[PDB]
Symmetry: C2
Subunit: 66 residues, 2 copies
């Protein structure tokens, strides 16, 4: 959520229950080059599948040899 | 049988994306005393959390090898 609503990621957040969870944990699903992140919260869950969509050449990484 | 039906599989579902998935799979979360079942589909995601209440006898799912 922010002061802009255009392109975040394709994530959906569904609110269910109000029962406490052990910890707000995130699960990553990786199937067929598809990532999915699940946020378990005490008021709902966020599930966000990403087919490496945001994976562009940003920043440009280069590992220092050693 | 009729219009009386407040009982349903209490799962929250949203349809997002349209990319084919490797397998419509389910991940079952068990954190604390909370169970959750996540359906990955090629056009949506179903997250069904169960704090151990939706225990009905049907479906009969042999655990698809995660």
């Amino acid at each position: 959520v922010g002061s802009e609503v255009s392109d975040k990621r394709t994530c959906v957040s569904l609110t269910t229950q109000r029962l406490p969870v052990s910890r707000i944990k995130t699960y990553t699903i990786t199937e067929g080059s598809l990532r999915c992140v699940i946020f378990i919260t005490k008021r709902g869950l966020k599930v966000c599948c990403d087919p490496q969509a945001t994976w562009v050449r940003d920043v440009v990484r280069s590992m220092d040899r050693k």
